[PDB]
Amino acid sequence: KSLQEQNSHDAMDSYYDYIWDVTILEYLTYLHHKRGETDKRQIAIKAIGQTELNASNPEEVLQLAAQRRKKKFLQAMAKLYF
Amino acid sequence: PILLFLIDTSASMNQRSHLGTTYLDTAKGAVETFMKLRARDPASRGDRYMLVTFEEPPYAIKAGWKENHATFMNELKNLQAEGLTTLGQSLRTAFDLLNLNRLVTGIDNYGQGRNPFFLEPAIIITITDGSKLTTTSGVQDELHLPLNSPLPGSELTKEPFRWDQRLFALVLRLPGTMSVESEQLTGVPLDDSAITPMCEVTGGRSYSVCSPRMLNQCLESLVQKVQSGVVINFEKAGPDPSPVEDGQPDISRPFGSQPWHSCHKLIYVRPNPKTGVPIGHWPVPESFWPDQNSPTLPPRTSHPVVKFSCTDCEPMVIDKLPFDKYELEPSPLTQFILERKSPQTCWQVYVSNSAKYSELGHPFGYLKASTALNCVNLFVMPYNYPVLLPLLDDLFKVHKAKPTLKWRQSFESYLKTMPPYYLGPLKKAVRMMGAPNLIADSMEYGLSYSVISYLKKLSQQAKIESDRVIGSVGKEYTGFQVALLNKDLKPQTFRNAYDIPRRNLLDHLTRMRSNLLKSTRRFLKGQDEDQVHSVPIAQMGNYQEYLKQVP
């Protein structure tokens, strides 16, 4: 519901590095293909096609990539606010 | 047969494996290697290839009945995985295509029984990844097919699939980093996906792959299972399996959960060597006594439920009466019976709710071990064979057509107990028997007038829907939309001044002037027209004269 809207006052593409779920990136690619984003779609494809965020990795690799992205995103929020 | 591939085109199918290639490219390679391994088999001259993607209609059927092999290749190699994981709609669309042409041709004769000789073999293979099922509203936990009834006549069968088609699933689980441990299992595991219960219901199996070698084993196994047959659900009912006197009954044998209770398993239908269509004689009976005044037939099961009784009997095989016999492919029922090792005994198979007075059904067939004990065959005769067959024996032993009286009363009792749609084949039966006096044209009715009118009207709407679907495949104030860049634009630099960029404009201008001052035999409207996809020697060499025989 949040990603469907078109009035974001934060960044779109440069926050796509702090995502680690294939489902939400799947929805992002679908939204960008429907709504005409031919360039944010390629950013989503590059994010999905990483050999770090595959669904069938060992669980340790996935959770460690998740906590790395959690650290970087929370630091980015502490960069913006705080 | 009909090989249909349901290729998942969701964005989650865009993950990259350890091979440096995407999951979708692995799916295309799986289709290509399936082609090669199927073409190795010297029985695949006629095999119609179809492709369905995870895209909303009418852009759902990539290749269908009216396309050819080259367009199937071109649409296969040009797939983009940019959708959602909508498995239910795509599966319903594939089944709707296949059952649509099925009900168009009248391959399934409703009301006249079930004839497994009328067969259109079909295997559909869904290649996906096992991600979460996604809609536009949220994630869906459990796979539900939509029930909108688009195809006319969908209410006459409970399940959207049929008994001539089988579902298999290739779920790609290739890890991003290669596994240090090497998989050494001969068999392919089943997956914990949401597609596995569906393919177990339809009479298939879900192959789970984690390595390219595992993909080779899965695809070889999938090639080995593409044959022609009918999937029927065999179940036991009533008495327990009979303990052999030589065998020892044991408490350790499970009396509550035994692996061959129910099996949705295949039986083989060999083609006719002289024609191709198996010239058959006997139908597997319905699950209802036909009321010839009911306005509607009850909806039929997609997969027949046949009950076998394990009570030992004698296989009656009469001379010159054409029975029909099938081979049933390996199943825990078959390994049990091959462990029994008794080619002089048979088990009695029947269909419930097929009798006028009894919920139990009089036996219509027997399953029987072969002579070499290699496989267990299914022998089907007309309905109530232990009653009918000795009287036919008696007529060709003594009576010589024109019979006695009590035997007449025996056939009036039999035809009162006889199903009426079986009135079709049994008449045809005596056309091989040598006794045409038993033919009576007075009784030919098997269905009501209402259901026949409904069947004709259903066939007409099926023809209209078939035409529609075949035509569908292969195709400054509040009103302002900014145009997007088109890859298939083909910017024609000589036809229009708008398409020339500034930085080469004067250059191009001189070239344009040269064209209008060339005055050659051929005038070209494009600076660079190289080719499109393929540059063949044979295609261009045909457009020339080569007058050199040199003999």
Minimum CA–CA partner of A56 in chain B:
B175
Method for structure elucidation: cryo-EM
Give me the residue label for tokens 């199996």.
B205
| B85 contacts on A by Cβ (under 8 Å) | 26
Q: Tokens for B103?
A: 């009900």
What b/e string do you get for B267-302 counting C-beta neighbours within 10 Å, with b at 16 or more? bbbeeeeeeeebebbbbbbbbeebeeeeeebeebeb
Q: Assign B415 to helix, strand or coil.
A: helix
Instruction: Give Cα separations from A9 to A5, A6, B542 (angstroms).
Output: 11, 9, 63
What span, in angstroms and rounded, lies between the C-alpha atoms of B237 and B113? 22
d(CA B28, CA B343): 47
Please count the other Cβ atoms lying within 10 Å of the Cβ belonging to residue B73: 16
Q: Can you tell me the distance from the alpha carbon of B86 to that of B379, in angstroms, rounded to the nearest whole number? A: 42
- Here the contacts of B176-183 (C-beta below 8 Å, separation 24 or greater) are B176/A50, B176/A51, B176/A52, B176/A53, B176/A54, B176/A56, B176/A57, B176/A61, B176/B15, B176/B16, B176/B17, B176/B18, B177/A51, B177/A57, B177/A58, B177/A61, B177/B18, B178/B18, B179/B210, B179/B211, B183/B210, B183/B211, B183/B213, B183/B214
Tell whether A2 is within 8 A of chain B (Cβ). Answer: no
Chain A residue with Cα closest to B55: A30
Rounded CA-CA distance B51/B124 in Å is 9
Cis ω on the peptide bond leading into residue B315 (within 30° of 0)? no
Q: How far apart are alpha carbons B55 and B72 in whole angstroms?
A: 17
The verdict on a CB contact (< 8 Å) between A38 and B484 is yes
Please report the resolution in angstroms: 4.1
Domain with residue B191: its CATH number is 3.40.50.410
Contacts of A28 in chain B (CB under 8 A): 11
Looking at the DSSP assignment, which residues form a beta bridge with residue B124?
B4, B167
Domain residue limits at B138: 3-231+454-468
Q: Any idea which residue has 């006249």 for tokens?
A: B112
How many residues appear in chain A?
82
Exposed e or buried b for every residue in B255-264, given b needs 16+ CB within 10 A?
A: eeeeebeebb
Contact: B210, A56; criterion CB under 8 Å: yes
Chain A nearest CA to B151, separation (Å): 28
- Judge contact between B234 and B365, C-beta under 8 A: no
Helices assigned H by DSSP within B106-147: none
Q: Which residues of B369-406 are buried (b: 16+ CB within 10 A; e: fewer)?
A: beeeeebbbbbbbbbbbebbbeebeebbeeeeeebeee
CB B122 within 8 Å of CB A47: no
Please give the single-letter amino acid code of residue B288: F
Which ranges of B344-500 would DSSP assign to H, the alpha helix?
Answer: 385-394, 406-416, 423-433, 449-472
Helix (H) or strand (E) holding B324: strand B324-328
Q: And the tokens for B340?
A: 């029994």
Name B128's bridge partners: B171
Q: How far is A31 from chain B (nearest CA, A)?
A: 9
- Residue B132 in contact with residue B86, Cβ under 8 Å? no
